[PDB]
Amino acid sequence: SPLKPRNYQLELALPAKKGKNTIICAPTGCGKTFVSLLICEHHLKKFPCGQKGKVVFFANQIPVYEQQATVFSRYFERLGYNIASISGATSDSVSVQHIIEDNDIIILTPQILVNNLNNGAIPSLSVFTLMIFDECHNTSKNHPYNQIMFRYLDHKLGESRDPLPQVVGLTASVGVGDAKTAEEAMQHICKLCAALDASVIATVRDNVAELEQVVYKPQKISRKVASRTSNTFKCIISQLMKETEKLAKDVSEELGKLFQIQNREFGTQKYEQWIVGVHKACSVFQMADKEEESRVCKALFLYTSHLRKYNDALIISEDAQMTDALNYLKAFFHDVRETERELTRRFEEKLEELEKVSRDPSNENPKLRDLYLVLQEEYHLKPETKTILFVKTRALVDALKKWIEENPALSFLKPGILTGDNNILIATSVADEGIDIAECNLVILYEYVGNVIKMIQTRGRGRARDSKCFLLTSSADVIEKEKANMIKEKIMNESILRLQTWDEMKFGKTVHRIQVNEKLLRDS
Ligand SMILES: Nc1ncnc2c1ncn2[C@@H]1O[C@H](COP(=O)(O)OP(=O)(O)NP(=O)(O)O)[C@@H](O)[C@H]1O
């Protein structure tokens, strides 16, 4: 049995079901493909005896193409519709023309259709009754989408009496181009609507709460936070890491080459990725001498295991306390218990100095001080605040929890680790788990870099009472990007709301004037 549509899905689909050329603008994750399934089904059922609709669906990316092809065939083939998909994988050895003739829904990469319009294989877009453009914000410049639309519009603004298909675009963002004001952003959006001959921009307006149970992005308030003026722990550990890398790179010339790779600085997620890469290269490594293959790989796995621990401790020192970074290392080296004994005593030779720098009060992490300031402010204003604190890595979770537990100035916090009484839960990225922030009053992104964090809100408390989100970062770059993106999104949303308020004749005339201008340019 078939999925029940969400209400906001019906809401988005409705204008297209009424036959209007529509741009559906809805967030990543809310299931626009399913909305397009609803539109296509309704569309095809419109036709009376004898008549048959014919839908073309354009995919912009190969992986997405394959997925859509599968979704559409799975859903419609069962109902006895002819469904086909074709891309460059097969286009040069089949008759696109006959595939279009034989099918009710065709999933295509667009260049294929462009090629077959240009050689007359498909003499006219009139053969389609509905065209769906995924990622439709791409209908610009000289993209294949725009090239298809040029023909559609030449036909529309010309003297032919042959009908044109309905056009529906899907996108997560109509975008704003280089607009800085609502005036310019509205112009940009009207030009995209002109490009796709759209008369409606459909967004979720009536069923927002239901949407937000599926995908939700809160407003972020960014705050610049201090960071270390020096890191002696990091200098020492970095030296251990260089020694270790020398040892590792020399195991095998062939695998040695992997250490040539640059843009993998100590104490970063890039370094961790590089390590994953090394383990990967090892997994498929082969020599004729199998015992030696085994020796090389065992060696590399040992060395890299250590490097990974070091890299993690560096990150811990970066965002949290040196002592907890050091404990992380001590725990590892104890737990592992001979290259191993050597590496172990190489670490042990630094222990006294490491302990020294870690115990030095002047090595308190100033970033933690700013985190403290934020926490103290918010709990001072609202003592019953519940908080979710996101950090960069799994090891940082334990380090932050320890910091809170040992800090008498944070006596108001009872920390716990997010599972998937406590007033603050600590977590790192773990997709594709959606976090429900309808619980908490405060979300803190603490120097958070990595995979985006998928959030939902299972209920609303009013916008004033919905959870706050702070982005704490030491990067001026990140703060500037956040600010710019916030402006873009504001002007885009206000522009859309305005356009949605417009009289249909006003909108139609505005769009038509744009289309006339663009065609006049192209024709010359
Ligand atoms: N009404 C629904 N009931 C149950 N599952 C749904 C419904 N709508 C969508 N889904 C599922 O949610 C998943 C969405 O995956 P996704 O890659 O995001 O799809 P998409 O529609 O192509 N792109 P997007 O709009 O960004 O979500 C799919 O597995 C859908 O089947």
UniProtKB/Swiss-Prot annotation:
Q: Which residues form a coiled coil?
A: none
The membrane-spanning stretches of this chain are: none
Q: Which post-translational modifications are recorded for this protein?
A: Phosphorylated in resting cells and dephosphorylated in RNA virus-infected cells. Phosphorylation at Thr-501 results in inhibition of its activity while dephosphorylation at these sites results in its activation.
> Which Enzyme Commission number(s) are listed?
3.6.4.13
From the record, give the cysteines joined by S-S bonds: none
Catalytic activity annotated for this protein?
A: ATP + H2O = ADP + phosphate + H(+)
Q: Which GO terms describe its molecular function?
A: ATP binding; ATP hydrolysis activity; double-stranded DNA binding; double-stranded RNA binding; GTP binding; identical protein binding; pattern recognition receptor activity; RNA helicase activity
Deletion: any effect?
A: Death between 12.5 dpc and 14 dpc due to liver apoptosis. Those who are born alive show growth retardation and die within 3 weeks.
Please tell me where ATP binds in this chain: K4, Q9, A26, P27, T28, G29, C30, G31, K32, T33
Phosphothreonine modification sites are T501
Region annotation (Interaction with ZC3HAV1) ranges:
1-524
Q: What coarse category fits the chief subcellular location reported for this protein?
A: cytoplasm
Keyword Magnesium in annotation: no
Compartments, as annotated in UniProt:
Cytoplasm; Cell projection, Ruffle membrane; Cytoplasm, Cytoskeleton; Cell junction, Tight junction
Which GO CC annotations does the UniProt entry carry?
Answer: actin cytoskeleton; bicellular tight junction; cytosol; ribonucleoprotein complex; ruffle membrane
Q: List, in alphabetical order, the GO biological process terms annotated in this UniProt record.
A: antiviral innate immune response; cellular response to exogenous dsRNA; detection of virus; gene expression; innate immune response; positive regulation of defense response to virus by host; positive regulation of granulocyte macrophage colony-stimulating factor production; positive regulation of interferon-alpha production
> Boundaries of each Helicase ATP-binding domain copy?
13-192
Keyword set, alphabetical order: Acetylation, Antiviral defense, ATP-binding, Cell junction, Cell membrane, Cell projection, Cytoplasm, Cytoskeleton, Helicase, Hydrolase, Immunity, Innate immunity, Isopeptide bond, Membrane, Metal-binding, Nucleotide-binding, Phosphoprotein, Repeat, RNA-binding, Tight junction, Ubl conjugation, Zinc
Q: Which family does it belong to?
A: Belongs to the helicase family. RLR subfamily.
What free text does the record give on domains? Answer: The RLR CTR domain controls homooligomerization and interaction with MAVS/IPS1. In the absence of viral infection, the protein is maintained as a monomer in an autoinhibited state with the CARD domains masked through intramolecular interactions with the RLR CTR domain. Upon binding to viral RNA and ubiquitination by RNF135, a conformational change releases the autoinhibition promoting further homooligomerization, interaction of the CARD domains with the adapter protein MAVS/IPS1 and activation of the downstream RIG-I signaling pathway. The helicase domain is responsible for dsRNA recognition.
Subunit notes for this chain? Answer: Monomer; maintained as a monomer in an autoinhibited state. Upon binding of viral RNAs and conformational shift, homooligomerizes and forms filaments on these molecules. Interacts (via tandem CARD domain) with MAVS/IPS1 promoting its filamentation. Interacts with DHX58/LGP2, IKBKE, TBK1 and STING1. Interacts (via CARD domain) with TRIM25 (via SPRY domain). Interacts (double-stranded RNA-bound oligomeric form) with RNF135 (homodimer); involved in RNA length-dependent activation of the RIG-I signaling pathway. Interacts with CYLD.
Name-wise, this protein is Antiviral innate immune response receptor RIG-I
Which species?
A: Mus musculus
Give the gene that encodes this protein. Rigi
Residue window of the full protein shown: 240 to 794 of 926
